[PDB]
Short mmCIF file of N, CA and C in Angstrom, two decimals:
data_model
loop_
_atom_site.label_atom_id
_atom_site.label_comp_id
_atom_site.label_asym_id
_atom_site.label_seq_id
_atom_site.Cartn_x
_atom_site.Cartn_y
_atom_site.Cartn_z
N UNK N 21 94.34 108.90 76.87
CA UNK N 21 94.20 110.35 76.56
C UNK N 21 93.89 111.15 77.82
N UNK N 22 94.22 112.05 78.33
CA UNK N 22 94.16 112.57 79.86
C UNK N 22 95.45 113.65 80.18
N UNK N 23 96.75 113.77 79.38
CA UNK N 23 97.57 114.54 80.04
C UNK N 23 98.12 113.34 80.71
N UNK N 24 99.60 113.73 80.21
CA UNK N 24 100.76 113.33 80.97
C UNK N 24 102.07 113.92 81.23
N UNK N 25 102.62 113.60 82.08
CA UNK N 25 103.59 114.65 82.50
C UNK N 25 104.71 113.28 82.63
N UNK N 26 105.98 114.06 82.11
CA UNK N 26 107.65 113.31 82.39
C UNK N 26 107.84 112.83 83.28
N UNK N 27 108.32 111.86 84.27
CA UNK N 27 108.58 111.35 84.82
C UNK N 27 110.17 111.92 85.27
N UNK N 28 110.69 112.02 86.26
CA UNK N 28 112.29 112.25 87.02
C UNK N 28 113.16 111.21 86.35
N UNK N 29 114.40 111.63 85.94
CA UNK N 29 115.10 110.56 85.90
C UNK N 29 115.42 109.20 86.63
N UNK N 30 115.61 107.83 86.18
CA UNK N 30 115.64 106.81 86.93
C UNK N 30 116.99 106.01 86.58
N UNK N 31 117.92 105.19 87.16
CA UNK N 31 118.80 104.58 86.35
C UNK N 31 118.49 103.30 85.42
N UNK N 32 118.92 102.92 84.46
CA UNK N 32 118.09 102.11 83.56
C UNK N 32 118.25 100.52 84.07
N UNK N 33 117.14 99.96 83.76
CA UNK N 33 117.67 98.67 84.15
C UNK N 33 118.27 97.75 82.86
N UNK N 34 118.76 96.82 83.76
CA UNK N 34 119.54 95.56 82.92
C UNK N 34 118.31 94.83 82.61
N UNK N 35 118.02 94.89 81.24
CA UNK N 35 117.26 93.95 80.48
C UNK N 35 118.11 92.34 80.20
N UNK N 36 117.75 91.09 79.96
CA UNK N 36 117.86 89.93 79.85
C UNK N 36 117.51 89.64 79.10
N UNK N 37 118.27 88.88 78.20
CA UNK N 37 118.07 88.01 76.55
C UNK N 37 118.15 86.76 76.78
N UNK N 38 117.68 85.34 76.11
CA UNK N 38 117.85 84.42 75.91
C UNK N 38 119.01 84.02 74.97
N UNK N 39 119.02 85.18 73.92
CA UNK N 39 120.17 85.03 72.55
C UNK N 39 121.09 85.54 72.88
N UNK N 40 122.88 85.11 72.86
CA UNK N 40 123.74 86.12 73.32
C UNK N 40 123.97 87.53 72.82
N UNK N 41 123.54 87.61 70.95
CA UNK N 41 123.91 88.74 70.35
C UNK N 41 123.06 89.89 71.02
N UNK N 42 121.84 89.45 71.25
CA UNK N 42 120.75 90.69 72.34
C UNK N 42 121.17 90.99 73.57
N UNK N 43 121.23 89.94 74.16
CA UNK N 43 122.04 90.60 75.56
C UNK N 43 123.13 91.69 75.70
N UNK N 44 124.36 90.71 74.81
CA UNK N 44 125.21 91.66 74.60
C UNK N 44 125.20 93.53 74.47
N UNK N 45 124.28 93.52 73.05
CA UNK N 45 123.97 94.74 72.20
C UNK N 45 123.32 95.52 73.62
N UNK N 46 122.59 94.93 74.19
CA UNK N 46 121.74 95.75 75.17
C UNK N 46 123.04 96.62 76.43
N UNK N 47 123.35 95.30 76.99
CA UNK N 47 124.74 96.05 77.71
C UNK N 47 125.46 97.36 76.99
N UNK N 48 126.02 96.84 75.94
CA UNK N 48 126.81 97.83 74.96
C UNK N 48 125.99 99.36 75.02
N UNK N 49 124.61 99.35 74.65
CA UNK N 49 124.26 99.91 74.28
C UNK N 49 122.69 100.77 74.83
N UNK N 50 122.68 100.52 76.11
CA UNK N 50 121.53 100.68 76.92
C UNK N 50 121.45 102.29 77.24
N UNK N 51 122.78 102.43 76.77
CA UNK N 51 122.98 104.36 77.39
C UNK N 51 122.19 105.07 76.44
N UNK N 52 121.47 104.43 76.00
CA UNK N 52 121.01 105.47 74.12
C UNK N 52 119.48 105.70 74.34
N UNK N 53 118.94 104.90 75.29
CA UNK N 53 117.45 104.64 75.40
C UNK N 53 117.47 105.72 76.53
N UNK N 54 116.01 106.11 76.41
CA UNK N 54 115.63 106.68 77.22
C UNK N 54 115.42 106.75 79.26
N UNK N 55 115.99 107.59 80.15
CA UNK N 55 115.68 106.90 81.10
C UNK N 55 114.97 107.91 82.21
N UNK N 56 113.74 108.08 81.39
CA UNK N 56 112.57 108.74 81.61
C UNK N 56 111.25 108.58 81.22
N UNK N 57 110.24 108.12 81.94
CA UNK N 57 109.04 107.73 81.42
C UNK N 57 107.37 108.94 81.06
N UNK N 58 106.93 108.67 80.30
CA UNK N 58 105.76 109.65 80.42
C UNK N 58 104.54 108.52 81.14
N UNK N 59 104.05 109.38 81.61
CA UNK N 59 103.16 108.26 82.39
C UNK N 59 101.50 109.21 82.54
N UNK N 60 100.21 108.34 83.17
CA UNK N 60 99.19 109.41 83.67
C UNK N 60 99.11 109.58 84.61
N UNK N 61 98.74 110.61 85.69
CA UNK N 61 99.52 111.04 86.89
C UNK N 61 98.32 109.99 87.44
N UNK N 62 98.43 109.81 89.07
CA UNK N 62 97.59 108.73 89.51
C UNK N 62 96.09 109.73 90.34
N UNK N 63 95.18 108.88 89.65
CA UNK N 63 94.01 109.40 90.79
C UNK N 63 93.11 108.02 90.74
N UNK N 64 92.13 108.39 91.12
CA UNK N 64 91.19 107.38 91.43
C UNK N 64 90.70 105.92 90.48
N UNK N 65 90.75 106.55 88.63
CA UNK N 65 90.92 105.44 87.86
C UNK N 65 91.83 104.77 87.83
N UNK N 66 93.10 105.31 88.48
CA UNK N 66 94.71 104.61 88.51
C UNK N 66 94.69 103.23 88.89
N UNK N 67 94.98 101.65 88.58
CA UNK N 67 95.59 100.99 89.15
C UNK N 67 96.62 100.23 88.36
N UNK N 68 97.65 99.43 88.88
CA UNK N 68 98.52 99.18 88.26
C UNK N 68 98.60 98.45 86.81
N UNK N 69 97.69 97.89 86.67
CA UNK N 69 97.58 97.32 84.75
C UNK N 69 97.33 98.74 84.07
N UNK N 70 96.02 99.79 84.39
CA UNK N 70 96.52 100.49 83.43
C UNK N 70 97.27 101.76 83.74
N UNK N 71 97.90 102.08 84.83
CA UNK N 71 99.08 102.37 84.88
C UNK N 71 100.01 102.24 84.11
N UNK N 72 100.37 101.21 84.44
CA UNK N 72 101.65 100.67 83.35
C UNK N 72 101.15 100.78 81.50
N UNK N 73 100.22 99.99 81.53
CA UNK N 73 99.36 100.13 80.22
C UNK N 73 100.15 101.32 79.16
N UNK N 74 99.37 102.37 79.89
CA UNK N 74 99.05 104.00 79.42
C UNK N 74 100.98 103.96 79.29
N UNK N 75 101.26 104.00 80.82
CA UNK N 75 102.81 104.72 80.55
C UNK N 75 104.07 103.96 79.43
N UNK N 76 103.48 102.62 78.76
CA UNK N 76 104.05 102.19 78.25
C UNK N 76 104.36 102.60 76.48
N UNK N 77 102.50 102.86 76.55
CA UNK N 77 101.89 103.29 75.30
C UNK N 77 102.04 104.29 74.94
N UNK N 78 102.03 106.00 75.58
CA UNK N 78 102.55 107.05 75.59
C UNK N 78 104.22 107.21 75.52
N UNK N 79 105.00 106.51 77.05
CA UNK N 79 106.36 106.71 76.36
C UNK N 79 106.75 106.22 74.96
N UNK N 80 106.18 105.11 74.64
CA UNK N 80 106.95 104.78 73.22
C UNK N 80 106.07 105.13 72.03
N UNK N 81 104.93 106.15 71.88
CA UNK N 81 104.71 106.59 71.55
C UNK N 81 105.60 108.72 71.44
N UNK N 82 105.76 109.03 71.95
CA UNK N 82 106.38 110.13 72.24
C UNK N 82 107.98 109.77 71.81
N UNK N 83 108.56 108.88 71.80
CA UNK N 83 109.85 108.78 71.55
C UNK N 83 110.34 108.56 70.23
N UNK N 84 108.76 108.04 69.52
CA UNK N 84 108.73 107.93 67.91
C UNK N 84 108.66 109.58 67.32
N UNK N 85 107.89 110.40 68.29
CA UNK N 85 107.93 111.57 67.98
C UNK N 85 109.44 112.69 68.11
N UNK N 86 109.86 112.23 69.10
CA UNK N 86 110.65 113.32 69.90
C UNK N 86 112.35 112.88 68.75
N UNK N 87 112.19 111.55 68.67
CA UNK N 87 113.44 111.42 68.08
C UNK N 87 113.33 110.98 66.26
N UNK N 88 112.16 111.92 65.91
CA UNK N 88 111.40 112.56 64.73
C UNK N 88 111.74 111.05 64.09
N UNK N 89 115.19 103.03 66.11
CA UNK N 89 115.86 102.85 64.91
C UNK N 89 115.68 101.64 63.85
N UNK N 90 116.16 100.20 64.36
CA UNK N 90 116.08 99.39 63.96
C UNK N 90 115.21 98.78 64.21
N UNK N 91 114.98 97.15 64.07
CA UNK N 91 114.20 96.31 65.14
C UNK N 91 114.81 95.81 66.24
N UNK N 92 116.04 95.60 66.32
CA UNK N 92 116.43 95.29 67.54
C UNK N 92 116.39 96.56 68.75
N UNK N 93 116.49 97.81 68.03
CA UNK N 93 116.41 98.98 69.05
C UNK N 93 114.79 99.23 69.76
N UNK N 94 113.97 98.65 68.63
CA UNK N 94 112.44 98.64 69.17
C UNK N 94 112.11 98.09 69.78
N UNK N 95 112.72 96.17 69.67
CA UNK N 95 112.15 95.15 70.85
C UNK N 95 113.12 95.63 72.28
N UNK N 96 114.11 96.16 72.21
CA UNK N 96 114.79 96.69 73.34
C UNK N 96 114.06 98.25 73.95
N UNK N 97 113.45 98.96 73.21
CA UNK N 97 113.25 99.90 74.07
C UNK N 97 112.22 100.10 74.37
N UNK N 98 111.29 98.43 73.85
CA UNK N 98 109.53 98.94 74.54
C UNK N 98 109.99 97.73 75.54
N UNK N 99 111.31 97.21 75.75
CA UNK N 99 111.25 96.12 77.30
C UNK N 99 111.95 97.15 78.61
N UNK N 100 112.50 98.13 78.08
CA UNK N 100 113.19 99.13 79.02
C UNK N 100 111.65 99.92 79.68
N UNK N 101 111.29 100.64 79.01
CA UNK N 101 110.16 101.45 79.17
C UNK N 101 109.01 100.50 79.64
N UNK N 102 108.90 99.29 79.47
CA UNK N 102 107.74 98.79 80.77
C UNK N 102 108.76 98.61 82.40
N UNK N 103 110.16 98.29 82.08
CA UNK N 103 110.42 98.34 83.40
C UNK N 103 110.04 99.44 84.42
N UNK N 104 110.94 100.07 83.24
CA UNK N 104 110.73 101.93 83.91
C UNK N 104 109.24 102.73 84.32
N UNK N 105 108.34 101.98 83.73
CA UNK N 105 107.07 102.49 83.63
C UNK N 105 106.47 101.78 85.37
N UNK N 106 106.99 100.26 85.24
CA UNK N 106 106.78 99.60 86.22
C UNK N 106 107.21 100.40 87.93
N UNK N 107 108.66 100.98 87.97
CA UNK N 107 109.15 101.76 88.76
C UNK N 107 108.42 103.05 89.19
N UNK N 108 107.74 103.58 87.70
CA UNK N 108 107.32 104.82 88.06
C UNK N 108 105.95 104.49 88.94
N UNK N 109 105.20 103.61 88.75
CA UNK N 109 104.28 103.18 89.37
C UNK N 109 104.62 103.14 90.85
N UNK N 110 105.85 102.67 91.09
CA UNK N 110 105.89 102.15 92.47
C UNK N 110 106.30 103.54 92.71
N UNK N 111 106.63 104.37 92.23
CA UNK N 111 106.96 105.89 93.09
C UNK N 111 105.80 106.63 92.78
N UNK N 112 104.58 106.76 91.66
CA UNK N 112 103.87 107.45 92.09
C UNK N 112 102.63 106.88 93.06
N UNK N 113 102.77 105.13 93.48
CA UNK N 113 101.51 104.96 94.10
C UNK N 113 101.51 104.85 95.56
N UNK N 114 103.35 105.16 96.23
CA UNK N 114 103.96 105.19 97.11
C UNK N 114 104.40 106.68 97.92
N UNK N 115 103.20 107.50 96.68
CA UNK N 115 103.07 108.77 97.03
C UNK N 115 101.54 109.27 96.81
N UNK N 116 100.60 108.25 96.17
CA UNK N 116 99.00 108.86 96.25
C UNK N 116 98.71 108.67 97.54
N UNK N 117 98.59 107.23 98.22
CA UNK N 117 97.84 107.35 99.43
C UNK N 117 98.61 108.17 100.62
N UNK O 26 123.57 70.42 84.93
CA UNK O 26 124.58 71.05 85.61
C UNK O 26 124.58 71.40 86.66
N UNK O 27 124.55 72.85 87.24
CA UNK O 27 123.92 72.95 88.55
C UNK O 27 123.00 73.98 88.75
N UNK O 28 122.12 74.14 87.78
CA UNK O 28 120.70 74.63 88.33
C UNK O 28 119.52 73.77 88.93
N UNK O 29 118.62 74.48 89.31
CA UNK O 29 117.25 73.85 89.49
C UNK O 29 116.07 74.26 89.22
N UNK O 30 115.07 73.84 89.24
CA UNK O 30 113.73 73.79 88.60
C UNK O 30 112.88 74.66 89.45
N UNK O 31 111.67 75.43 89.09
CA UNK O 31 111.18 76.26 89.78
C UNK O 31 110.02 75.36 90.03
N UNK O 32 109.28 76.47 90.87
CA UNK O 32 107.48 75.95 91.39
C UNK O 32 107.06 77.00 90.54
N UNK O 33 106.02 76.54 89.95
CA UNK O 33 105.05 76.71 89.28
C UNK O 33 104.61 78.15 89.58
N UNK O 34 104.58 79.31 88.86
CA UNK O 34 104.08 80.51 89.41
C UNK O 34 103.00 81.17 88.22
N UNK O 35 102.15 81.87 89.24
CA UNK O 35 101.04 82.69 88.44
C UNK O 35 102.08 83.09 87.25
N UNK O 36 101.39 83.29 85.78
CA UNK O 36 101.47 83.71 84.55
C UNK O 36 101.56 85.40 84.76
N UNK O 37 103.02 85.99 84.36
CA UNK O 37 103.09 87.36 84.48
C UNK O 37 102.17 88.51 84.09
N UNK O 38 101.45 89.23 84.03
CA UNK O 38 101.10 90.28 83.13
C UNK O 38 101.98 91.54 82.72
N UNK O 39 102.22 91.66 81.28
CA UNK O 39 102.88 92.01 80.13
C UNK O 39 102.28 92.95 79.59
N UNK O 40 102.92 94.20 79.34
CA UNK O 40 102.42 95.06 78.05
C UNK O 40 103.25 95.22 77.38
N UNK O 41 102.25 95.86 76.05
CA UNK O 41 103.36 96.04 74.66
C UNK O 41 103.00 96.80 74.09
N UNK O 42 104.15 97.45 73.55
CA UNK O 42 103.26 98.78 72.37
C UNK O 42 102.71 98.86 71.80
N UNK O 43 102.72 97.72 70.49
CA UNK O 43 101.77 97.15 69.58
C UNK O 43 100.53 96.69 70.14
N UNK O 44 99.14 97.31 69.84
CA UNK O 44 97.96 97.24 70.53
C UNK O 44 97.13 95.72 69.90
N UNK O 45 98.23 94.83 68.91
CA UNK O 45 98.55 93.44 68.57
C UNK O 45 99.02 92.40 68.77
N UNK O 46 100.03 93.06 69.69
CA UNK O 46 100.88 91.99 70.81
C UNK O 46 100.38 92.33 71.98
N UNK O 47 99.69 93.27 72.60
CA UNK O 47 99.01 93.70 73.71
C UNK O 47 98.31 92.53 73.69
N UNK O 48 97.24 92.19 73.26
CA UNK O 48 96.13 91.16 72.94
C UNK O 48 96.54 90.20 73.09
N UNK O 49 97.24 89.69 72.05
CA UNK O 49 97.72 88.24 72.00
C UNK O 49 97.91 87.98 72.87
N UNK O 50 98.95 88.43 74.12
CA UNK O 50 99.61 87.92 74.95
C UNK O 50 98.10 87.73 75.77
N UNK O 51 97.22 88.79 76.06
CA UNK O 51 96.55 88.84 76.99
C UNK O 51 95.57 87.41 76.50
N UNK O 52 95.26 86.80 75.73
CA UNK O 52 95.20 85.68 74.64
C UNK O 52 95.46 84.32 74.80
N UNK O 53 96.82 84.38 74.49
CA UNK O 53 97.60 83.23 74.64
C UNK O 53 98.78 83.00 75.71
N UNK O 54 98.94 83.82 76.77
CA UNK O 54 99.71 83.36 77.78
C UNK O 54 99.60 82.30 78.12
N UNK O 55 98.25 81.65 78.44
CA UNK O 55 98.21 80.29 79.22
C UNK O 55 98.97 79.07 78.53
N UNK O 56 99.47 79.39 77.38
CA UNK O 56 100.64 78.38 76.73
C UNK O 56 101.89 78.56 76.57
N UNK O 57 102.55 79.55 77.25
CA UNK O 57 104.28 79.66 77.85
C UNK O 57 103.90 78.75 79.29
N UNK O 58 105.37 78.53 79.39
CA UNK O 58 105.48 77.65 80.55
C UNK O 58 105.55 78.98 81.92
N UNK O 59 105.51 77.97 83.21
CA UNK O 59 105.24 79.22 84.35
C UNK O 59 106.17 78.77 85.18
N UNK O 60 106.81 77.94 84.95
CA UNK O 60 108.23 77.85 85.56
C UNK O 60 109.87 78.24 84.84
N UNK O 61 110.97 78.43 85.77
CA UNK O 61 111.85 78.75 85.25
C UNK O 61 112.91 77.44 85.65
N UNK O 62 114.16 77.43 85.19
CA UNK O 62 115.03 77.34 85.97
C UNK O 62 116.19 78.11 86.55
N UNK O 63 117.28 77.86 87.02
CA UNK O 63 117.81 79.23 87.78
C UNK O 63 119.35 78.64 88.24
N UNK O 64 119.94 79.21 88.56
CA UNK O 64 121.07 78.85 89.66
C UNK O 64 120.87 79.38 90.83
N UNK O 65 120.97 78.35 91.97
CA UNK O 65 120.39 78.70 93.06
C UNK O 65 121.03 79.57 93.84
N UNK O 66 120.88 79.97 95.23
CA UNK O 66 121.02 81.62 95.87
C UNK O 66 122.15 81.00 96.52
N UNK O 67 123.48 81.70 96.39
CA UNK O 67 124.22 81.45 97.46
C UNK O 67 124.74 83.15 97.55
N UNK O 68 126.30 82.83 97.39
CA UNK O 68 126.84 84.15 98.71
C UNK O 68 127.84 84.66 97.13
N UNK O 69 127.30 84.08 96.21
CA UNK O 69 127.92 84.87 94.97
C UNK O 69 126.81 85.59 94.03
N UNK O 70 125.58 85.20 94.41
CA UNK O 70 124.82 85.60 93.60
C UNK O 70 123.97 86.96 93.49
N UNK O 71 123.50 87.90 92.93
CA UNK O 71 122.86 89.28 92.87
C UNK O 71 121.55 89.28 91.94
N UNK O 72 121.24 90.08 91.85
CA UNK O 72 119.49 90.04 91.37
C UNK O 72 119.91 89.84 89.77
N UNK O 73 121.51 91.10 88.98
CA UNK O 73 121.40 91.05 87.90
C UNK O 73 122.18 89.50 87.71
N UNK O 74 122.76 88.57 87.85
CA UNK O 74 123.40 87.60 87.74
C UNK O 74 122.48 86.40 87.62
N UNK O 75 121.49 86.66 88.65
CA UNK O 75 120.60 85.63 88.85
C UNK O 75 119.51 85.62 87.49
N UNK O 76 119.06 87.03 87.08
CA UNK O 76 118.28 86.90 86.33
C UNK O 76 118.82 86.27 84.56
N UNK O 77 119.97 86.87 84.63
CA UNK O 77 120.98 86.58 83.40
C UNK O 77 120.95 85.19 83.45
N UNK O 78 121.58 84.52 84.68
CA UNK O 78 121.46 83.03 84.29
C UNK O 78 119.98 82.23 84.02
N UNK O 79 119.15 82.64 84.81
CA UNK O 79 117.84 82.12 84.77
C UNK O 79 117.54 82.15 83.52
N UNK O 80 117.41 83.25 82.51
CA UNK O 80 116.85 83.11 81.47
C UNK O 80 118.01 82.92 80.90
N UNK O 81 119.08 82.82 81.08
CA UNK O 81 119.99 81.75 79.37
C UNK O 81 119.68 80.45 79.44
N UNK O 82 119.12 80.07 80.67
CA UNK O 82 119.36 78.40 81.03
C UNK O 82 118.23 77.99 80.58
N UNK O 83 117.24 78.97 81.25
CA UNK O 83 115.92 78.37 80.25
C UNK O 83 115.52 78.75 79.34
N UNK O 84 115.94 79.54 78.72
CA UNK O 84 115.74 79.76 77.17
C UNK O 84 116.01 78.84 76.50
N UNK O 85 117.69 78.48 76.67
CA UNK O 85 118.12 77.05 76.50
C UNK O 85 117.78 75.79 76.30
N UNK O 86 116.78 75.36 77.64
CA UNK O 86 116.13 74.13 77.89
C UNK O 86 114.57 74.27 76.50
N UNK O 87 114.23 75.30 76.32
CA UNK O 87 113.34 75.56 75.62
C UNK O 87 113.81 74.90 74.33
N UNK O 88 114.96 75.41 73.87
CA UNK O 88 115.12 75.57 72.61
C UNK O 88 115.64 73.94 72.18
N UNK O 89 116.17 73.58 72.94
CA UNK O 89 116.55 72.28 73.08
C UNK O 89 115.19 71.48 72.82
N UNK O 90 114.64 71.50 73.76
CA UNK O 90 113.05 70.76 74.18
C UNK O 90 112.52 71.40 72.90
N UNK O 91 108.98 77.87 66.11
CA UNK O 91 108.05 79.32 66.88
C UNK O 91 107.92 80.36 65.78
N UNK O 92 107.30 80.94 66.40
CA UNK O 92 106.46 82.16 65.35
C UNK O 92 107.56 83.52 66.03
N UNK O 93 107.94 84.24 65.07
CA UNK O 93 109.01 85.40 65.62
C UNK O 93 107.62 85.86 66.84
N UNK O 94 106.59 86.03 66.94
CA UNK O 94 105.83 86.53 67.68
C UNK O 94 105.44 85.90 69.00
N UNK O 95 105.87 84.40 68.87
CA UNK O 95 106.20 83.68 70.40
C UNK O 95 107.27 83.63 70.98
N UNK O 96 108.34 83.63 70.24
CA UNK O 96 109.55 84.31 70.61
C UNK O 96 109.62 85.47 71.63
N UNK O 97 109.37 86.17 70.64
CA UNK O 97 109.45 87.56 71.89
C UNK O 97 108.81 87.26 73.18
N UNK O 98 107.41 86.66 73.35
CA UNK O 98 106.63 86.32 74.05
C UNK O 98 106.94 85.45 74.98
N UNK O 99 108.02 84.46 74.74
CA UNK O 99 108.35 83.71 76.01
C UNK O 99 109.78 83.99 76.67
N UNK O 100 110.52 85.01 75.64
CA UNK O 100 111.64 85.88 76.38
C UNK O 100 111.48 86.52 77.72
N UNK O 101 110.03 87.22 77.13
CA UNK O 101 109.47 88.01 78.22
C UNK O 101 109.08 87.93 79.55
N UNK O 102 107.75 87.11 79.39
CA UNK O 102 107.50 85.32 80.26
C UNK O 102 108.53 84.78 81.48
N UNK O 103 109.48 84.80 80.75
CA UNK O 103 110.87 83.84 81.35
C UNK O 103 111.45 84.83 82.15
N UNK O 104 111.93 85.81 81.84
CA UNK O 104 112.55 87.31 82.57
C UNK O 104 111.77 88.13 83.48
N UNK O 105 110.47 88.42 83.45
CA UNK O 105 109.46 88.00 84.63
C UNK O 105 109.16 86.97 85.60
N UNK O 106 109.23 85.89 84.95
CA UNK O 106 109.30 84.69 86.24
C UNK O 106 110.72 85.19 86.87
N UNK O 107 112.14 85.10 86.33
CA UNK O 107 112.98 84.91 86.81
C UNK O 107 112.85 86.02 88.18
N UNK O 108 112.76 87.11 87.68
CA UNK O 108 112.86 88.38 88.44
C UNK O 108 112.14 87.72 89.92
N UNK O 109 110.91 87.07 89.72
CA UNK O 109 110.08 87.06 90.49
C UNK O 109 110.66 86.04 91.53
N UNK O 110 111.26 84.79 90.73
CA UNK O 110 111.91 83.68 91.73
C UNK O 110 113.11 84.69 92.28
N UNK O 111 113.79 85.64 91.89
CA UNK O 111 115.07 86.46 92.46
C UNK O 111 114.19 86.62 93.82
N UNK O 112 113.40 87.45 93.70
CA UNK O 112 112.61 87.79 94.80
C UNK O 112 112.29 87.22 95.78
N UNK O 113 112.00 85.89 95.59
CA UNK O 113 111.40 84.68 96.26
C UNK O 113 112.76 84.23 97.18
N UNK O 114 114.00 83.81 96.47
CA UNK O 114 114.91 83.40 96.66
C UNK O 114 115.64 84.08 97.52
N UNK O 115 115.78 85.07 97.07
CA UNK O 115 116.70 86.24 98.20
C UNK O 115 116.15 86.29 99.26
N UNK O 116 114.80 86.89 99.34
CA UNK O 116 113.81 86.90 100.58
C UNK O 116 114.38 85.61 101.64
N UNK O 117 114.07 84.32 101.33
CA UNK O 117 114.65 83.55 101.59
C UNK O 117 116.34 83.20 102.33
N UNK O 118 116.85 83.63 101.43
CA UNK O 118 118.66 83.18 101.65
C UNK O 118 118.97 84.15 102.49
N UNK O 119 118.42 85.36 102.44
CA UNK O 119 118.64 86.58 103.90
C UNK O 119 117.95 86.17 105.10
N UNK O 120 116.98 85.26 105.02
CA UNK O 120 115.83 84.74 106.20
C UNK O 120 115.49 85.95 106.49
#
């Protein structure tokens, strides 16, 4: 809880399945997910567990809101959004100090 | 065939939306395995190729050798290590 602000667009990454039908679907279909994170901006409580934590919990929280699907679209778009969350980290902590 | 076996690496840290699978994992990680296997680095290989094979092969060896909730859990596991041996590996094969 603190305020968070959008994150810049990023290009999405290639997620990895063990099962072929997931992999597949993900390729096919990766353009649909989001490729923007909400995150908490960084200050002094910031480090990278709850960094990521927060920005994981908020984006996929907000996306239940914003897009007012399945289960395969859920286990796929809370593994996108820690990548992305992961990235945003490395750009906002590559800009605190 | 022609992969190989990893070294043993620190246990990833994971989040999840569910503030239920958050836990668990933080829980029960110490019982996924902390190695992968892989196809090794040559002059065809890229980060997304490498990671794709890493985890079909050992997903594979797994399944060969669960609770829908360890499932997810050692998908995850496995695609983190891999990433991480990419890292290791490349570093490497560029010297």
């Amino acid at each position: 809880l603190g305020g968070y602000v959008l994150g810049s667009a990023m290009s999405r990454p290639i997620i990895h399945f063990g099962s072929d039908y997931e992999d597949r679907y993900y390729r096919e279909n990766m353009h649909r997910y989001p490729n923007q994170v909400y995150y908490r901006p960084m200050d002094e409580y910031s480090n990278q567990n709850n960094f990521v934590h927060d920005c994981v919990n908020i984006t996929i929280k907000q996306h239940t809101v914003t897009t007012t699907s399945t289960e395969t679209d859920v286990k796929m778009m809370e593994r996108v959004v820690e990548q992305m969350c992961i990235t945003q980290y490395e750009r906002e902590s590559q800009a605190y100090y």
